[PDB]
Amino acid sequence: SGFRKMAFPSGKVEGCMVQVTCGTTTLNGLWLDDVVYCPRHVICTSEDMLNPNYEDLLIRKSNHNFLVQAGNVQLRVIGHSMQNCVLKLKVDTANPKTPKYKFVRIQPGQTFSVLACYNGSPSGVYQCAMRPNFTIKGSFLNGSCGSVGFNIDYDCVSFCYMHHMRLPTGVHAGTDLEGNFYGPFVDRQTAQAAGTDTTITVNVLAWLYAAVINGDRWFLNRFTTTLNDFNLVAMKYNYEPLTQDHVDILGPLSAQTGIAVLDMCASLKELLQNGMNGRTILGSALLEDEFTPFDVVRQCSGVTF
Amino acid sequence: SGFRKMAFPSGKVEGCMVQVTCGTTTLNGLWLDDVVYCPRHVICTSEDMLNPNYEDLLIRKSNHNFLVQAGNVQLRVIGHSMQNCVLKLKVDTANPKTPKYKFVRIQPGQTFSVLACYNGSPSGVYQCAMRPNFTIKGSFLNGSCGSVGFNIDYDCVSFCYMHHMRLPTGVHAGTDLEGNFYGPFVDRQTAQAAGTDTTITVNVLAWLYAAVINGDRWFLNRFTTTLNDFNLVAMKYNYEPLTQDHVDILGPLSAQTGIAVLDMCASLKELLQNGMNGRTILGSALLEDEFTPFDVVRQCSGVTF
Ligand SMILES: *[C@H](O)[C@H](C[C@@H]1CCNC1=O)NC(=O)[C@H](CC(C)C)NC(=O)OCc1ccccc1
Ligand SMILES: *[C@H](O)[C@H](C[C@@H]1CCNC1=O)NC(=O)[C@H](CC(C)C)NC(=O)OCc1ccccc1
Numbered sequence: 001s002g003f004r005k006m007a008f009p010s011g012k013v014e015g016c017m018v019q020v021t022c023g024t025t026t027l028n029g030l031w032l033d034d035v036v037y038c039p040r041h042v043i044c045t046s047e048d049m050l051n052p053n054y055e056d057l058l059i060r061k062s063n064h065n066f067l068v069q070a071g072n073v074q075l076r077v078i079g080h081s082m083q084n085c086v087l088k089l090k091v092d093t094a095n096p097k098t099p100k101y102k103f104v105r106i107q108p109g110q111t112f113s114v115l116a117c118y119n120g121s122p123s124g125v126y127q128c129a130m131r132p133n134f135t136i137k138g139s140f141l142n143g144s145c146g147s148v149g150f151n152i153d154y155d156c157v158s159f160c161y162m163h164h165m166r167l168p169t170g171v172h173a174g175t176d177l178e179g180n181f182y183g184p185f186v187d188r189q190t191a192q193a194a195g196t197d198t199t200i201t202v203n204v205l206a207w208l209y210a211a212v213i214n215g216d217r218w219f220l221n222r223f224t225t226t227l228n229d230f231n232l233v234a235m236k237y238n239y240e241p242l243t244q245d246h247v248d249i250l251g252p253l254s255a256q257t258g259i260a261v262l263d264m265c266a267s268l269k270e271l272l273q274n275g276m277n278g279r280t281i282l283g284s285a286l287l288e289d290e291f292t293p294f295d296v297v298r299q300c301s302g303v304t305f
Numbered sequence: 306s307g308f309r310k311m312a313f314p315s316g317k318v319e320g321c322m323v324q325v326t327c328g329t330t331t332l333n334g335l336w337l338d339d340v341v342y343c344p345r346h347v348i349c350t351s352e353d354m355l356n357p358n359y360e361d362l363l364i365r366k367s368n369h370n371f372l373v374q375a376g377n378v379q380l381r382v383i384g385h386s387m388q389n390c391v392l393k394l395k396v397d398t399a400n401p402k403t404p405k406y407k408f409v410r411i412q413p414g415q416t417f418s419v420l421a422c423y424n425g426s427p428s429g430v431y432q433c434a435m436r437p438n439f440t441i442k443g444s445f446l447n448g449s450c451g452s453v454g455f456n457i458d459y460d461c462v463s464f465c466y467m468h469h470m471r472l473p474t475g476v477h478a479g480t481d482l483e484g485n486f487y488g489p490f491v492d493r494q495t496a497q498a499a500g501t502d503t504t505i506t507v508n509v510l511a512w513l514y515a516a517v518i519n520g521d522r523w524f525l526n527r528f529t530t531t532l533n534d535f536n537l538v539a540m541k542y543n544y545e546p547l548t549q550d551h552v553d554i555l556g557p558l559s560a561q562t563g564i565a566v567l568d569m570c571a572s573l574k575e576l577l578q579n580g581m582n583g584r585t586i587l588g589s590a591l592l593e594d595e596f597t598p599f600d601v602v603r604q605c606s607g608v609t610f
Contacts, residue, residue, distance in 0.1 A: 002444040002476040002597070004428035009420065011316030116313065121609035125309035125430055137588070139307040141607040170519060172308040214475060278580075287588035302446040304426035 003210050003282050005290070006299060007113035007125040008152045014099030018075070018118030020089070020146065021067040024216050028117040028146030029068065030159070030177070032097040036068055036075070037299050038146045039164045039176060040087045049189045058082055069120060070095075070266040084179030085164065097114040099157050103177040108132045109200045109240075111292050112151050114161065118143040128161075129290040132198040132240065134183025135171040136161070150178075154305050167192060200289040202246040205286045208264055209253040211281050212294045218279060220259070225266040233269045249293050308515050308587050310595070311604060312418035312430040320402030324425030325394070326372040326453065333422040334373065335464070335482070336400040341373055341380070342482060343451045345392045346470045346492050347464050354494045363387055366576030374425060389484030390469065397411070404462050410483040411465040413437045414505045414545075416597050417456050419466065423448040433601075434595040437503040437545065440487025441466070442474040446449075453482075459610050472497060494574045503546040505594040507551040512593045514558040514571055515601045516586050523584060530571040534573070538574045554598050 013030075020029040022042045039244035041049060043057050046142040063077040066089055079090035087218055106112060108130050116139060128136045128149060140147065140163055149161030163174045171194065181187075183194060205212045208219070231241045247261045254261050268287075276285060297303075314395060318335075325334040327347045331482040334343035368382040371574055384395035402515065411417060413435050421428045421444060433441045433454060445452065447466055454466030469492055478547050486492075490500060513524070528557045536546045554564045559566050573592075581590060602608075 001471045002442060002477065004431045004442075006312065006421070006431050006444060006446040007312055009315045009319050009427035011314075011319040011427075013593050014316040015316050094528055116311070118609050120609050122314035122316075123607060123609040125314055126309045126311050126594075137307060137309075139309040139311060140602055140603075141306070141557060142609060166306045172307065202499070275583075280591070286585070299429075299444055300446075302423050302428060304428040 001214065003296075003299060005127050007127045007296075009305070010113070010115045010122060010125045012014045012099040012152065012157050013115050013148065013150055014122050016095060016099070017115070017117050017120050017122060021069075022061070026119060027143065028120055029089070030146070030148055030162070031070065031075075031091070032098050032101060034091050034094045036089040036091055037162065037246055038087050038089070039175075039187070040085050040179070041145070041164065042087065051190075054082060057217060058087075061063050061295045080295055082179075085175050085181060086162065086177070086179030091161060100155050101157040101159065104151075104158045104160050105132050105176045105178075105180070107133060109168060109203060109292070110160075111290060111295055112149040112160050114163075115272060116140065116144055116150045117147045124284045127290070129200065129203070130161075130182060131171075132200065133194040133196065134181075134185075135167065135169075135173055135197070138163070140166060140172050149174075152305050159189065167194060169193070169250060199237065199287070201234060201240040201291065202249065203240045203289045204239070204287050204290055205242075205246075205250055205261065205264055205268065206253060206293040206296045207282070208268065208289045209250070209257055209259070210291065212257050212259060212298055212302060214282060216281050219267050219276070219281060221267050221269060221270055223266040224260065224263045225269060226262065227265075230262070230265045230269060233272060237272050239272070252297060253293060306521065308519050308601075308604060310432050311535060312432045313455065314486075314576060314610070315418070315420045315427060315430045315455060316421050317462050318453065319427050319454055319495055320420050322420070322425050322427060323402070323575040324374045325369060326374075328367070331408065331424060332448065333425055333443040333469050334394070335451070335453055335467070335535060335561060336375065336380075336396070337403050337406060339396050339399045341393070341394040341396055341463065342467065342510065343392050343394070344467060344492070345390050345449070346386055347392065348471065352388070352575050356493060358408060359387060362508050363392075363593055365602065375502075375510070385443070387484075390480050390486060391467065391484030405460050406462040409456075409463045409482075410481045410485070411487075414508060414597070415465075416595060417454040417465050419454045419468075420452060421449055422452045427488055432595070434505065434508070435466075435487060436476075438499040438501065439486075439490075440472065440499045440502070441473075443468070443477045445477050454479075456498060457610050461493055467593065472499060474498070488531075501543060504542065504592070505537060506545040506547045507554065507598065508594045510547075510551075510566065510569055510573065511543070511601045512596045513573065514562055514564070515596065515605060517562050518605055519587060521586050524572050524576060524581070524586060526572050526575055528571040529568045531567065532570075535567070535570045538577060542577050544577070557602060558598060581603055
């Protein structure tokens with residue numbers, strides 16, 4: 001009963017968050033073993049962030065110019081390197097709280113939990129989808145940079161995101177933990193924008209399933225459709241073209257509800273062409289695309305860690 | 306930038322979650338010092354839960370009939386008592402992870418984070434409002450009972466909720482940590498229902514402020530109103546009557562936006578009488594009442610712990 005946007009528990013990552021200061025610039029860092037990971041723009045003055053030469057800017061920096069603080073304890077920096085748009089600081093101490101972990105580049109459409117941090121302290125936790133245009137719709141204020149997104153598979157933390165910037169639209173962009181941006185973004189204060197965002201069709205269908213399961217069904221019709229004719233309608237609404245692989249992935253939900261995917265696709269086409277007429281689904285007056293098929297299964301199968 | 310429903314970080318509470326088995330019934334418990342707290346219906350067979358005599362049912366139970374497990378470690382139960390609808394098990398070990406904590410009965414309209422647990426393992430974290438009818442709209446499956454809701458004030462965990470039941474509507478009911486239900490609910494499988502829910506007006510206004518701040522303003526009109534005439538309209542829409550105290554509480558937001566509360570009330574009346582015409586606010590096609598004025602300030606003032 002109930003379907004909520006749910007974040008993973010944040011304890012494991014909470015113990016990996018530190019504060020990194022370089023001059024006047026303070027942001028957050030991720031401490032795993034004897035390496036702290038942070039956005040490289042920590043080394044920029046306010047002037048620099050219009051058109052920085054990070055190679056040249058780091059050349060003038062030494063280990064002692066990096067102030068890293070865990071709680072009130074200061075870590076000694078004993079080496080530094082730049083990997084893409086992230087800085088790896090080698091420290092004298094390995095994090096005793098280092099969890100089992102992995103670094104994963106995540107695919108668009110996929111979800112993760114974000115631990116929003118300021119001054120190396122956890123502020124709060126929310127779940128996000130990597131949007132098709134490689135932006136995320138988060139809540140990040142200044143000081144949030146170096147906050148990370150993650151998944152937990154039983155015991156293993158899979159870090160997929162580190163925060164670097166907001167775009168004029170008020171959306172957010174960042175890197176994987178190897179410092180490669182998701183999307184065509186660069187760490188400079190220039191005119192930057194993301195493409196057209198698409199609705200993640202596979203994720204909307206899954207959310208429709210979650211509804212049936214929770215007892216919302218008004219939207220169910222008496223018709224079916226064909227993938228191709230469904231997508232003709234998808235095109236016009238900026239919904240992602242649905243594939244056979246998608247249909248396979250929804251198979252578990254289809255099975256547990258006894259609703260064929262293409263019957264649900266017919267339901268969806270009606271909502272796109274007819275709206276929800278003031279009616280709501282799982283208490284949303286719009287269609288939600290930020291729930292993965294798996295997110296739904298887990299939440300409707302009570303999976304823990 | 307961005308406004309998201311945000312849960313507190315769950316690390317501190319994660320270390321207080323245990324599994325409690327009594328016969329065939331397993332649910333979660335909260336371990337603080339040498340006391341584990343759990344719902345008393347753990348002592349019920351499936352037959353018992355239609356009309357249980359908890360006094361009589363506990364009389365037949367001994368300390369050794371309670372299996373409490375932290376991780377894989379079993380705790381020895383050395384005493385038991387029933388306080389309202391919660392059981393306090395005294396154990397041989399005090400939780401070494403016991404955080405600074407408090408037990409608070411929360412007021413309707415107020416929010417908290419829930420750590421959803423199964424078999425004493427954290428599954429995930431979400432934020433909830435205590436609704437005026439003293440229900441919550443959560444995601445709880447069987448095994449979730451003994452999961453708790455909490456706030457964190459810097460260092461102090463303020464536990465306000467423990468989960469016991471779902472109602473036919475698919476909403477949820479539970480107790481404070483002294484075992485007193487919120488609302489007129491009882492722990493039996495009987496026909497039970499909550500009253501009419503009201504929209505938490507103060508919280509909707511705050512969310513409107515959060516929007517302005519994030520750049521959504523279409524809804525702003527060229528008029529004002531009076532508390533009394535606003536509420537005449539509130540009445541009809543099952544919105545909570547707004548008070549002067551409410552207006553005082555929104556004062557900080559009013560000030561930072563330069564929008565008087567009563568001008569915003571005029572905006573609100575138009576949306577109630579005219580709808581949002583397919584338009585959205587902070588990407589919601591409806592009005593959100595599950596954000597406290599404070600929740601907004603914190604999220605728009607980047608407060609941590
Ligand atoms: C790092 O914490 C900060 C977070 C931004 C600040 C406002 N909301 C956020 O998410 N990011 C930056 O300062 C970033 C630094 C560049 C050198 C990558 N600049 C940026 O995000 O530009 C957009 C911006 C808009 C409004 C205020 C500040 C920055
Ligand atoms: C405790 O984990 C369980 C959680 C319920 C089960 C389904 N969704 C939930 O939140 N609560 C109970 O089992 C509770 C026990 C009574 C003796 C208090 N019974 C209950 O919630 O009745 C309603 C119900 C509806 C549908 C399935 C199961 C129970």
